[model samples]
Target: GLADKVIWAVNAGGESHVDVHGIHYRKDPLEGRVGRASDYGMKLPILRSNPEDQVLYQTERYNEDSFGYDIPIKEEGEYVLVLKFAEVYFAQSQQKVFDVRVNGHTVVKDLDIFDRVGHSTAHDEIIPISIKKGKLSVQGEVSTFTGKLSVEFVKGYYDNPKVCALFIMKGTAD
Candidate 1:
């Protein structure tokens, strides 16, 4: 349960900066990279005014179709994936909406950031995942949670799916 006991602050793609407040973040894409999801070449525009919280608001990865990160875990157990966001571009509610899934299970469908948390604000959601024992031990490998979770932006409603950061931690079985 080593992996389940540690908190992984995965920055989907951003600069290597230290967290000053309630969260921590990493720069590299978890595991590796795949699909149409590409990291922003440079830092994203700042939605709010702050030096400490600037890293959390920078470098957002976006996709029109389904795109995500494949994270590897140290152990097979329960985990909680926390997705972070800030409506930097959108100006009003219902302007941009999308859906988030964990292990192919729809957790938040038709998610509207502006409608939910308004603009220039930070928001996050935690989803639980169960990694059964020996799930990824075959083929001479360990365990990975890649492709098991993803985000898809509704084409008609939102132009693209975006993510600011991701925080994965071990969760207690409930």
Candidate 2:
């Protein structure tokens, strides 16, 4: 049987986004790819901050790919996963959701996304998810929201911020 691996992105204006990536080994979420920073090695700098992950007060918008972040597994094993998203303000309605999985184990199945399509809102708190990876995989979805993001896993205590630091220090550019 095949499992679900959701990968998605969205802007406050109903546009999809990209941020970060590394996932290659997958079962279904092969479309998941994290976005790379822009030419200046940063997001657009005009994009609004995602309420969930305060890392990006004036977070930059992803210019490439779609999913904010993802990881690729090499062998059969267990791992933890985490991702961030900003809620859309004043949307016609909330329909944002993303399906995530690893080697088939459903990680995030259509998590409810909330962000006013045209207004400011609070960012959702960053969540730490535990995953038992048989074949590490992750995926997400977005339709009408925007935010800061980073899909990461703790392989060991010694780890670096997967492009998240770029957003964290992203103060408004005068």
Candidate 3:
């Protein structure tokens, strides 16, 4: 099924290929600064989702202010955007916070990895998107996307904005 195939994927701070749950995420050369969790992430308990993909959460791209990825898409259809994260450094709530916007529409707001899920556990925000004739729509918000999809991470007062990995799949939100 097309839904099972990945249209675009990136291992945020990785330098090589990373295969997770059958999806291959290529190294990211997009934007932001890279950071690795080292042994801290590997020593944690199993992740809540796709534990085998724990390596995906070990490396991340972070920005002091804000950063974004302008991904080029050559097709138009229904798609699902998966934003992955994990609190590998922070151990307490409110330590790290941020917001994620897709195509300039706010999807995940006031996201606190440690506050929502404990340290080193996998967390994913799945957003449903519809593209038709170059316009992208999500949750009633619409924007023009001639050939690119913009994903932005807004920094919070508590800490820098960061993300481990992300992928777009051909499928409905459900």
Candidate 4:
């Protein structure tokens, strides 16, 4: 399955949530979670720039109690990781701030979705990293490819860290 060229799309919330076009997202339970956002409520408003409902709608997961995913992969190679976000609970950019860490390293710190997206209702960022043996980390700094990688979203600024969706795709070598 490692070489299946598979793409993982994890929907933060449980069932009953979908885009305007009725596309379903697969729920991912956090080891011991119900597969929904911790502070669950409200819909991402359709803004001028992001008129699409898919971009405007997302579930905000509560990070009050150990948020983030320790994802395990079968293949040992490079992958492109994408995280989707929206300021669902706040009206201002400064309200919801957070940190993104991969394998204990800070990738994005003090991230304000509203400020970054500007006039848009949704936003996302892509990071390309390698998975060797099994451990997921950058190419250096003494780590093995152990088939398991920990990707954590930490709370920063004010409240719990939130996320809408996450995508992981295997990368082909150049």
Candidate 5:
């Protein structure tokens, strides 16, 4: 199932635990501020996720400027990077817009979670990754993998760049 395909999963600002999908998410603490939707009286009804898995979207890691995650990869061939997000704060669109870069390549440009799915809803950006030899290819951009994949959220003009959860799987989204 998905558990076997998952190479790595992170709960972001939350603690380490296993979800209903049988995926064990590791807790990666960020230097930025961590927040929970429940504390703000927001209903985290994450679409396409289990009831217990809603907690993944409830908790998030955010910064005033920019932040990133560097994940180590032991073995790589073809993989999928699943970036999970939810707009828990701003209600209107264009409040928080940012760009997502993987291994130095910009995959998502000016991504507005509130504009895409409103507030308190799940939004996932699935990107394909290919690692041949030591080169990493994402969205037609190639760079050195070096056994570590770097995921960065570049700050935009609107607000802060944040992420709720992320997953690196061994296969494609389909």
Candidate 6:
């Protein structure tokens, strides 16, 4: 249930000092190094990660930014988010920095997800977050991506169940 899913974030990836009224954001990616997505760009999967990996989605009819595509969740509660990845089959490296938080509560601490070419990891790390209004406040930092990664999200992927962290639709993070 946590092997494959997507979250959208755009404004979170502005190389500039962008600001959202209440949306949670990483301090450094403020330069756009690590944001949910590019700022003020109508990021898809802001709270929703992408289904496939290594592929950038940019079609004529649809784009990363803009409204229309979103996997609406029905209920709310504690959930798990994982980045399902594959082997590179070649020499590669990546420096990933991320964390999970909800309503100002840091559920998961700092984690460094390293990936090599050709192998897959079943357990990357359980990203626990409280949900509200059928969503969660998911934010993180992407310092580098020289390698590759695939991600997913699930409602109940663990033993202990907690609160649902709904993706706050509207807010500002400065």
Model number with the top lDDT = 5
lDDT of prediction 6: 0.25
Q: lDDT for each of the candidates?
A: 0.53, 0.28, 0.65, 0.56, 0.68, 0.25
What is the overall TM-score of model 6 with all chains considered together?
0.26
Model 6, 148-174: lDDT tens digits are: 111211211121111111222222221
Model 2 scores worst on lDDT over the 10 consecutive residues at 165-174
My TM-score estimates for the predictions, one after another, are: 0.62, 0.31, 0.79, 0.69, 0.82, 0.26
Q: Give the count of colliding residue pairs in each prediction.
A: 1, 25, 0, 9, 0, 52
Q: On a 0 to 1 TM-score scale, where does candidate 5 land against the true structure?
A: 0.82
lDDT tens per residue, model 3, 1-174? 542667777656444444555666656656533434333334564366454455665456545666676767877788788867765555666646677888777787688887776655667888878988878887678887765777777777544445456777775655
Q: Which candidate leads the pack in TM-score?
A: 5
Q: Which is better, 1 or 4, measured by lDDT? A: 4
Q: The CA-based lDDT of model 4 is what?
A: 0.56
lDDT of 2 by residue, 1-174 (tens): 011232222221111232333122221121233332222423322244442223232233432233334333333322223333333321332344333333233444443334222333223322322223322222332221113124422111111111222111111111
Better of 2 and 5 by TM-score: 5
**Candidate 1 residues 1-174, lDDT tens each?**
433354666554454444554555666554344223244433444455265455555456554566555555556666666667655565656656666655445566666766776645556776666666535322222344553434333332654435556666665434
lDDT of 1: 0.53
- Candidate no. 1 TM-score: 0.62
Model 6 has how many clashing residue pairs? 52
Q: Which stretches of candidate 2 lie over 4 Å from their true place?
A: 1-53, 56-70, 74-78, 89-94, 102-105, 115-174
Which is the better candidate, 1 or 6, if ranked by lDDT? 1
For candidate 6, give the lDDT of residue 12: 19
> Candidate 1: worst 10 consecutive residues by lDDT?
134-143
